[PDB]
């Protein structure tokens, strides 16, 4: 299928974003050597994703989907990997310590944002089936329902996490407080980017 | 492939047109009972072609070719079968006797017009390969070369056949002379219709 | 609806073709003065159809159908009116007398060919409803069924009519025999042209 | 301009059809050797037109017009040349003598049908200007007006020519009478084919 | 009109964003209970907008506009409502007090950013008229002129507001200063998002 | 070429962004009067870019590229100029002093981000050549290679610059530290926006 190269790229981007959980777990236990190694794994997966992206961009004729849709889809997908690499780099660069009280909830929030990327990977895969009449509406309905569940959870977790940070601001350095808010925001951006992947698929299905 | 139903229809239309050779051979030996039976075979193949045409017209989503191109292709194909059925019916209806001197050349002309339909069937089949970058130009070049060979032969045979009829006009009834010219014309129309099949394929390849 | 100007043109083309029945009825009773007047009515309706055609060709923006489909549809429609005008002119020009024995069957054949034009008018009208998801397949299925009924009848009548002419050839002038076959053919062409109208509509429905 | 190869082909097709006037003038003066030579000129121009057709079919990227429109335009254009070659061949093959009384009017009818081809050549050329907003409607309006003038003339001439033939039928051989009607028809077909050229241009302008 | 569901969604998104003025007015008078209630109104309007969005995404055939354009338009529209809900939530979560000196100018800046959303609502509505030739250029010209007026005002107000904040930084907590800059930025984002709505409409008009 | 107005706009946007180097050089030497004048030059170039943008938006027929692609391209281009104007305004508004140690590296980072805009200008220009078959893949390959070189450099410089800022945070006011990070981010955004210009061109080339 013409979607297979895209599925492979999306699988790589999911792998890259998923490494953020053990990356952060390592920072939390104070094992910076390990966090540095997991960041190399994140960079490798990003580099690999890039190479797949390149080959796709440079490679047809009779087509069941638009070339431009595939390119736009690819663009959204690779942003997820770049976000993961960026976040990990900024964290290593400041040796960011998530405050004790925020550790458990931060990991749960991160994991749920990564689940949003997991949904994107899942929808791209489920699309082979749709490529192999009326079924498109049911597909989009399901996608919407699945995302609403994840968004409800991530919103609640994001709020709790910020509420906790707000209570700790008086005891932290302001610049560190701001970089903690930026990190929560950036993590949330992974889920935003994953939503744009499903939007691009929905546009393709709307073309007939 | 989306072209498979079209290939099947084209195979049926070729079978239907090919029956014109034994149909005419039977009329020439004066076995009208047999010619009547071969005309039922021609009608059956036309009916079968129609049923395939109907199912295609009534039956998608992600598509490597345009729906409208397939419909226009189908329309041109079914004209070939209708032409064969029409010719055979008119011949049975008048009990048309091809004059002795014209028999051999008429059959050779008919056969070569049917070969033009054979080329259409061949190009439709060779298209799977093209469906499985630059190859499209070579495909069209070949198609053009193959048709030029057949057209050169059919033109020469048509001329010789009319030259012979012209010499015999003084000995035949005028209405019969006119119906002999119409039959030569109609046979030639099979090759014209087959050319329109290859033209429709060429248009599809031009869309990218 | 964007189809309304097309429906109006089709209504005019149907009116023009329908005048062929009383036109021929007049020739059969030997009232050539009346046939000449009905031919002026046929020419008027053709002129009127032309003026509608012109205004459409010269006259948008947001469109529920393709401009080019409407133009191609219009082209097929106006051929029907031109055919009626041509047939009537040739008949007046030769003062064509349909032989006695062929009169009743010729009129029934003509009427049934005109019914094929009536089907085209009917399908164009029924299209407003379709313009006001899955319904398109049922529409085409119905159109196919309606045409198959008319084609079965016209084929049978055409055969009977030619069989009768064949029996009378020995008693007629050959040129007159040939012009009688041409007239049967031309009448049959009205139904062929009407079929091309429904084909163009089917192509439009295939675009989504 | 992408239209330049099409203009060149159309110029060749016009040249080919125009040779029919001196071809027929030669037959009328009984100089069959000359008519045979002018028929070789007609065949040469057709062969040349074919070679241009071939190169176009085999030869882009960023395009101001649709590739498929150019191919369909080309197809209509080359039919005109094939018609001229066919007519000239059939006339040489029967050594067709146009009756004395029909000679002058036949040539005037032929010339006016060729003028219809001249209009097609003219519209294709005037299209460069349109290729170099609202101007498209005025262009089509003019084309329609120019064609209406030619069609009015050709219709009148065709009628007069058939009226004259009708008066002479009693003195000619029936087969010859029929081949004279076929020749008038075929000549008229040149103007029909030229009209289809302008229709294809009108469709292109309707795409925006 | 196919635009009606979009107009309804845009009306809801405007209502949702407009509630930010009384929401902020309540925070400024220290009535947090009221601000909390107005935030529930903002959430309700967002939820309602979502439900309209969902029904549109799941619901044709003959279309005067592209399905994908409507989906992209809808996506931009719903971002405005999400922005309003997000801003109100963050403000309630920190119990953000806009400093006294900034209150009047902040409200005027907010109101003018909301006017930019009002322009989007207005252009979507004015589009029915355009849906019911040359008029599209005048429409876009007007839209551009209307936006230039609003952008000139919002830019000036944004600058004055930041200039005032800059003067007060020495007397505030740094984290609070940063969250005040973020709030000004976020408000400005409403006007940015509204501009993207008009851009999507302009793209639709460019398709013909 | 239809791309010429776009090339002119891109040239203006490049000029506008390039003025950021002498603008910042002036701030670094403490010549605020000069920085204010260079900011007027930046605003002028932005105003000029806007006027070109407007004329393009308001101004065809036969087109080698899609109107909507040109509009989307234009939108991405004008964001670069708006970013330059915004950055310069914020810097003048706070009288931002880049710390001594960061001056040299900041200018080198800025210059390299501007080189990314230079690449966009270069690719838009090189596109005339492509507008005057297989060449499109080589074009995109080159563009990718050129960008990878610039991105490698900008990433390294951005990291070094943040590492240096991190070391100086203890000696600066927190709000100033945050506005220094925002300025590095904004500068980096110029290169992000330039990448989106090349992406839009790549999409156009993918349409055939």
TrEMBL record, chains A, B, C, D, E, F:
Similarity field: Belongs to the UPF0111 family.
NCBIfam families registered for this protein in UniProt: TIGR00153 family protein (TIGR00153)
Native species: Shewanella oneidensis (strain ATCC 700550 / JCM 31522 / CIP 106686 / LMG 19005 / NCIMB 14063 / MR-1)
Coiled-coil intervals: none
Domain of life the protein comes from: Bacteria
Name of the protein in question: TIGR00153 family protein
Gene3D superfamilies xrefs: Phosphate transport system protein phou homolog 2, domain 2
GO biological process terms held by the UniProt record: bacterial-type flagellum-dependent swarming motility
Xref: Pfam families: PhoU_div
InterPro entries (UniProt xref): DUF47 (IPR002727), PhoU-like_sf (IPR038078), Put_Phosphate_transp_reg (IPR018445)
């Amino acid at each position: 299928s013409p979607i297979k190269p895209l599925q492979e790229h999306m699988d790589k981007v999911y792998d890259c974003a998923s490494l953020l959980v053990p990356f952060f777990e390592a920072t939390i236990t104070g094992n910076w050597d390990d966090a540095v190694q997991i960041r190399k794994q994140i960079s490798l997966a990003e580099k690999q994703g890039d190479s797949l992206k390149r080959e796709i961009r440079l490679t047809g004729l009779f087509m069941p989907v638009e070339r431009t849709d595939l390119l736009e889809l690819l663009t959204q997908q690779d942003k997820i990997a770049n976000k993961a690499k960026d976040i990990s780099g900024r964290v290593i660069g400041r040796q960011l310590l998530i405050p004790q009280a925020l550790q458990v909830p931060f990991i749960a929030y991160l994991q749920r944002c990564i689940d949003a990327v997991g949904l994107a990977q899942q929808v791209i895969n489920e699309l082979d089936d749709l490529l192999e009449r009326g079924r498109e509406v049911d597909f989009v309905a399901k996608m919407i329902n699945e995302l609403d569940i994840i968004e409800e959870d991530t919103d609640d977790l994001q709020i709790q996490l910020r509420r906790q940070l707000f209570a700790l601001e008086s005891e932290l350095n302001p610049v560190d407080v701001m970089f903690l808010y930026k990190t929560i925001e950036w993590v949330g951006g992974l889920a935003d980017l994953a939503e744009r992947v499903g939007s691009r698929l929905e546009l393709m299905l709307a073309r007939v």
